[PDB]
Design a protein around this nucleic acid. Structure first.
Lengths: 134, 260, 218
RNA sequence: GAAACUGCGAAUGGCUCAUUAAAUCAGUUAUCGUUUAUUUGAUAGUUCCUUUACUACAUGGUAUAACUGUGGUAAUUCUAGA
RNA sequence: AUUCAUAAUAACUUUUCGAAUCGCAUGGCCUUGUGCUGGCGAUGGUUCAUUCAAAUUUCUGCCCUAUCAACUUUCGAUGGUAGGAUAGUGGCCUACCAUGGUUUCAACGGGUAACGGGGAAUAAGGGUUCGAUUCCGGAGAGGGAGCCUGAGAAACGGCUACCA
C-alpha cells in the first residue's frame, strides 16, 4: 500500500437529509482492494464521521487497475443515520442485528395456511380439537 | 377497462421529466391533486430528476414526512402530487426558493426567486364566472377558483394572486403590448409580445408573439401567457429567456463558454 | 340423535344422546319456530318446553324456518341470512340446506328451552354462566346500573381485575359519547365558524356592492 | 396486541389476437348530451314549534359479531344451537 | 353561439342533510360554576371544479374475393310524435304514424392460418414485403346465458344455470 487518495467531487450539504454528500474517488493504486471500513475511517478523519453514520457502498474497480469510484455520504446524528438508512447496509456495516426469518415461499405458505381461518381462531382450533378427540 | 391504469410505463413517462430507458420498471402514478400530470411537475422529479437531493423513494418519503417544503402556501405529503407552472417552490432547511416555468427547451428550468417573490404568482384566468349565491368566482391556470375579483378581470388575461388565501391583486390584460411567456408546444418556453391576436373563435385563437430579437412566431391562444408589460416582467426570468437558441448558437455558446 | 339444549336463564348449553325410538318419534310432523313439551320424551323432561331452534342434517346441511317439504333443497342466500357466510361485498350465493321439518336426517338438532318442568338437568339448568363482560357506552352503563342522566357513571364500572401472575391491576371500557369539554369546544368552534364565515362573506358582498355603486357613479 | 365489525380494497396486473372487412384501433378533434369512490382551490347563523307552562342536547337507544360455552357429518375458506 | 350560467319566486316531497365521530391536550378570566371560553390534526360533509376515471361522435383511414350485384325492413329496417328508458344522444325499448339507406366511389355477403401503428430489412433513390408477443391503445378469462358494492364490476384466483 503506497497511499490512499480519497477525493470529494461534488461536496453538497443537505440539512434536509442531514449530511454532506459527494463522489468518492479512491486511488488505491496497487494496494489490494478498496477496503470500505478503512475508507469509512479515513472520510471520518478528513471531514468528521465517527465512522458509524458514513455511507459508502459503491467503489467499483476501474480497468487498467488501481482506481475505484463510488459515492459517499456523511450524515449527522448517529440515530438520524439509523432511522434514515436501511437495515441491510446497516448490518453490512455491522452496527445492527440482521434477523432470521423463513423464506418468502414459507411466509406465503403460512398465508395460505391462515386463509382458511376466520375469527380469533382459538374458537376454530378448540372445537376442532374436541372433535378430533371424538 | 373497469378502471384506471394504476401505474405508468417507463417509455410511457414524460420525456420532460428528464429520465432514462434504464432504471427499473415504472413511473410514479401521480395520484389526485390540481395540475395535470403531463403539465404538472411533481416533487420527486424536482428533488431527484431536476435538482437531485436524494436517492431512494424511501429518502424522499421520510423527507416529505418531516416536510422540508412549502409550495405556494402549503406542503403536500404525496411524493408526486401535481404541482406546476408559476408555482413557487420553497425548501426550508436548505432555504431555496425556485419558481416553475419552462426552459427554452420546454423543460421546467431551475430558476431561483427570492422569499420575497415567494408570496405572489401569476394566475391565467380560464373564466371569470357568475357562481352561485351571487358568488362571482374566477378559475385560473393552477387548479383554482376565487371570489370577489377585480370584476374588470376577464378571460385569457392573467392576474397577480398571492399564495394561500389568494385575494386577487393587480392583473395584466391581453392586448397589443403585453410581455409574453409561452406555455405549450414548439413555441413552448418562448417570450415575446401580443403584436396581434387572431381571434379564431369556437375555441383556440392564435397570437403572434415576437421575441426580443424581433423574430416572430404564431402561438396558440392558450399557449399564450402574458407576464407583464414590455420592459416590466412581474417576476424574475430564467437563464435562456426562452429566446429560442438554435443548436448553432448553443454550440457556439459551448465553444465560447468552455475555457477561461 | 344429538340434542343441543340451550337454557338462556343460565346462558347454558348441553349435549344429550337421544337413543329412544318412540320418543324421537313424537317430534315428527313439526316445524321451525314451533314449541312442544319434552314430556313423553323423558320423565325428567316432564314439563320442560322447548321452541325448536335448528339442526344440521345427517350430512351437515341445516334446517331453516319456512323451508318445508321435508327433504333437502338448494337456495340462493345472502348477507343477514342464516347458514350462508358471505365473503365479499354484494355477495349473494346459492348453496344447499335441509328442510324445515322434522326427520331422522340430522346428526344434530338444537332446541332452546322455554319452560322448566319438575326435575332438573344435571349439567345444563344447574349452572350459572355469565356475560363475561358488561357494557361500555355511557348510556348503556347508566341503564345497566339504574342511574339518572347526571350520575357520573365513571366509578360504577365493574372492571376486569387481572393478576399478571401475581401483580394485580384493573382495566375497563373506553366510555364513548361521554360528555367532555372537548366535545363542547369543538361544537363551539363549529358555531363560531358558522357565524364567522357568514359575516366574512357578508362584508365581502358589502364591498362588492360598494364597488358596484362606485361604478354606477361612473 | 391474537382477532373481529367495518373503512376500503380485491375492477391490479400478465398473456393471447378467437371474432373481426369501419368492428376494435389511431389520431386532429370536440360535448352547450353526460356519471364521477378518490383528492383537495374554494365550500355551510335558518334544524324543532299556531310563537307561555314543549323535545335527552351533560349528547338520547338496542343489536349483535369477533368472544365464551353446546354442533354435525365419509368428507369443505361448510354449518345448527344459548 | 343555450330557454347557458345564475338564483328567487309559490307549491309538493315515505323528506336528504346539517356530523349524537376521534387524539394530544390544556390556556383564560371571575359572577368560583366546574362556568363558559379555547388551539393543534384524525374521519366524515354538499356542489362545482380539478386531478384520477368515463361516452360517442364530427372527421377520416385496413387484403382479397364479383365463382358475392344487388344489399336493407318477418320480429326495428330508416325516421317522427308521445311514452318508457340511460351517466346522458338515440328504436336503447314501447305504441301510434310515414317509406325507408347505399352504392359500379363495390354496398350486402364470405374468407382472413386479419390488431393494427411506432418497427424489420433492403438499401442512391424510387419504391416494396412481415409485424401474435416489452412503447399507443385496445377485446378477452372454455361457450353462452343470467347475477351484487362501488364512481366506474355481467369481474370470475366475486357469483346463478345449462352444455362438454
Amino acid at each position: 500500500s503506497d497511499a490512499v487518495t480519497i477525493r470529494t467531487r461534488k461536496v453538497i450539504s443537505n440539512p434536509l437529509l442531514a449530511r454532506k454528500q459527494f463522489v468518492v474517488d479512491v486511488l488505491h493504486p496497487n494496494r489490494a482492494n478498496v477496503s470500505k471500513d478503512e475508507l469509512r475511517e479515513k472520510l471520518a478523519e478528513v471531514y468528521k464521521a465517527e465512522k458509524d453514520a458514513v455511507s459508502v457502498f459503491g467503489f467499483r474497480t476501474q480497468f487498467g487497475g488501481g482506481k475505484s469510484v463510488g459515492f459517499g455520504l456523511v450524515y449527522n446524528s448517529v440515530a438520524e443515520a439509523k432511522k434514515f438508512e436501511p437495515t441491510y447496509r446497516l448490518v453490512r456495516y455491522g452496527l445492527a442485528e440482521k434477523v432470521e426469518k423463513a423464506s418468502r415461499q414459507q411466509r406465503k405458505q403460512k398465508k395460505n395456511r391462515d386463509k382458511k381461518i376466520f375469527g380469533t381462531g382459538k374458537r376454530l382450533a378448540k372445537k376442532v380439537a374436541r372433535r378430533n378427540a371424538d | 377497462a373497469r378502471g384506471p391504469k394504476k401505474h405508468l410505463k417507463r417509455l410511457a413517462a414524460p420525456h420532460h421529466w428528464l429520465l432514462d430507458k434504464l432504471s427499473g420498471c415504472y413511473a410514479p402514478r401521480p395520484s389526485a391533486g390540481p395540475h395535470k400530470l403531463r403539465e404538472s411537475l411533481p416533487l420527486i422529479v424536482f428533488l431527484r430528476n431536476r435538482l437531485k437531493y436524494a436517492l431512494n423513494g424511501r429518502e424522499v418519503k421520510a423527507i416529505l414526512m418531516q416536510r422540508h417544503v412549502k409550495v405556494d402556501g402549503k406542503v403536500r405529503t404525496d411524493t408526486t402530487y401535481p404541482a406546476g407552472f408559476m408555482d413557487v417552490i420553497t425548501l426550508d432547511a436548505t432555504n431555496e426558493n425556485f419558481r416553475l416555468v419552462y426552459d427554452v427547451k420546454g423543460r421546467f428550468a431551475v430558476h431561483r426567486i427570492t422569499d420575497e417573490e415567494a408570496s405572489y404568482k401569476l394566475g391565467k384566468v380560464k373564466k371569470v364566472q357568475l357562481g352561485k349565491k351571487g358568488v362571482p368566482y374566477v378559475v385560473t391556470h393552477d387548479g383554482r377558483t376565487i371570489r370577489y375579483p377585480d370584476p374588470n378581470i376577464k378571460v385569457n388575461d392573467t392576474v397577480k394572486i398571492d399564495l394561500a388565501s389568494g385575494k386577487i391583486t393587480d392583473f395584466i390584460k391581453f392586448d397589443a403590448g403585453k410581455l409574453v411567456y409561452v406555455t405549450g408546444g414548439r413555441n413552448l418556453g418562448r417570450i415575446g409580445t401580443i403584436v396581434h391576436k387572431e381571434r379564431h373563435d369556437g375555441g383556440f385563437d392564435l397570437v403572434h408573439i415576437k421575441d426580443s430579437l424581433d423574430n416572430t412566431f404564431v402561438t396558440r391562444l392558450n399557449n399564450v401567457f402574458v407576464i407583464g408589460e414590455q420592459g416590466k416582467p412581474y417576476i424574475s426570468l430564467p437563464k435562456g429567456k426562452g429566446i429560442k437558441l438554435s443548436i448553432a448558437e448553443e454550440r457556439d455558446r459551448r465553444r465560447a463558454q468552455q475555457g477561461l | 340423535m344429538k340434542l343441543n339444549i340451550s337454557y338462556p336463564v343460565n346462558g347454558s348449553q348441553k349435549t344429550f344422546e337421544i337413543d329412544d325410538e318412540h320418543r324421537i318419534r313424537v317430534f315428527f310432523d313439526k316445524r321451525i319456530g314451533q314449541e312442544v313439551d319434552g314430556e313423553a320424551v323423558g320423565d325428567e323432561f316432564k314439563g320442560y318446553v322447548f321452541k325448536i331452534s335448528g339442526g344440521n342434517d345427517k350430512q351437515g346441511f341445516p334446517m331453516k324456518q319456512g323451508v318445508l317439504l321435508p327433504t333437502r333443497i338448494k337456495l340462493l342466500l345472502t348477507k343477514n341470512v342464516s347458514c350462508y357466510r358471505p365473503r365479499r361485498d354484494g355477495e349473494r350465493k346459492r348453496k344447499s340446506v335441509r328442510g324445515a321439518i322434522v326427520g331422522p336426517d340430522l346428526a344434530v338438532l338444537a332446541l332452546v328451552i322455554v319452560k322448566k318442568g319438575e326435575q332438573e338437568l344435571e349439567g345444563l339448568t344447574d349452572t350459572t354462566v355469565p356475560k363475561r363482560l358488561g357494557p361500555k357506552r355511557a348510556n348503556n352503563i347508566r341503564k345497566f346500573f339504574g342511574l339518572s342522566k347526571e350520575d357520573d357513571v365513571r366509578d360504577f364500572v365493574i372492571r376486569r381485575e387481572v393478576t399478571k401472575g401475581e401483580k394485580t391491576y384493573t382495566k375497563a371500557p373506553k366510555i364513548q359519547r361521554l360528555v367532555t369539554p372537548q366535545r363542547l369546544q369543538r361544537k363551539r368552534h363549529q358555531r363560531a365558524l358558522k357565524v364567522r364565515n357568514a359575516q366574512a362573506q357578508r362584508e365581502a358582498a358589502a364591498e362588492y356592492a360598494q364597488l358596484l355603486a362606485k361604478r354606477l357613479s361612473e
